[PDB]
Ligand binder design. Structure first.
Ligand SMILES: N#CC1C(=O)c2ccccc2C1=O
Length: 264
């Protein structure tokens, strides 16, 4: 490709790139056809591409798919890349447990991104700190990696290939879930991770048990929201609207304010 300039590897095979035509930073993602259990279309593509095209309309919250190419043994995806960027997993490794004000700003922007995906008929299925980029200058979070996603539907899902420690007990125990409620569980895991510095459950037994112990000082409202998202019963979990109207979610900072206060 002379239409992009390839740079160094970000980490799976995704590379820093630069769109030759206008120097737009980009990430160039290579997906081997071997590793695709999920195909779709409009001719034959990875489902990850179908889902990206559905979420890449307009702005934002989700890293957009700008173009893609097919190769003999692989597809190549050209995605947005903010600059500077750092993913939520490193940010958490570096900074430890986040102050609640920062965690609320972040968790909200995630809630918006996930609602965007849902509105577009897309279910992500692997929401977790590693799958979230922070644009360090705009305080904006951007969801990446639809590689485990599906079309949103209202019936039961009987396959999952996301991250186990973020999967809910109805998956662990029955190999079934519904989209929204499973998503809300992962969002509960993510929030605990933001406020505690780490994920609450390592092993199936602690997932099935869904008892949450706090290793850090976390306020009541925040702990109540987390336990709400991690209700054992999928129908006892809040909807996105209920989560965004929870007291702990009031008075969120703008992304810009978030960067100026918490990101330098
Ligand atoms: N999936 C995916 C990629 C993705 O969408 C992205 C964008 C910027 C920097 C890294 C990445 C990813 O790893």
């Amino acid at each position: 490709e002379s239409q992009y300039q390839v740079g160094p590897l970000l980490g799976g095979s995704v590379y820093s790139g630069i769109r030759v035509s206008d120097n737009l930073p980009v990430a160039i993602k290579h997906v081997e056809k071997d590793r695709i259990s999920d195909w779709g279309e409009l001719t034959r593509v990875p489902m990850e591409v179908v889902l990206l095209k559905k979420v890449s309309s307009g702005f934002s919250g989700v890293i957009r798919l700008l173009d893609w190419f097919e190769r003999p043994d692989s597809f190549v995806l050209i995605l947005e890349r903010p600059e500077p960027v750092q993913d939520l997993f490193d940010f958490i490794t570096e900074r430890g447990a986040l102050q609640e004000e920062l965690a609320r700003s972040f968790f909200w922007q995630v809630l918006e991104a996930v609602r965007h995906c849902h509105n577009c008929g897309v279910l992500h299925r692997d929401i977790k700190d590693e799958n979230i980029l922070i644009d360090l200058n705009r305080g904006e979070l951007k969801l990446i990696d639809f590689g485990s996603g599906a079309l949103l539907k209202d019936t039961v899902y009987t396959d999952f290939d996301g991250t186990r420690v973020y999967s809910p007990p109805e998956w662990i125990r029955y190999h079934r879930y519904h989209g929204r409620s499973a998503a809300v569980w992962s969002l509960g895991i993510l929030l605990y991770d933001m406020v505690c510095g780490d994920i609450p459950f390592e092993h199936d037994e602690e997932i099935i048990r869904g008892q949450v112990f706090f290793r850090q000082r976390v306020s009541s409202e925040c702990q109540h929201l987390i336990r709400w998202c991690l209700a054992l019963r999928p129908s006892d979990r809040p909807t996105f609207e209920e989560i965004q109207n929870h007291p702990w979610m009031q008075d969120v900072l703008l992304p810009q304010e978030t960067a100026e206060i918490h990101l330098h």
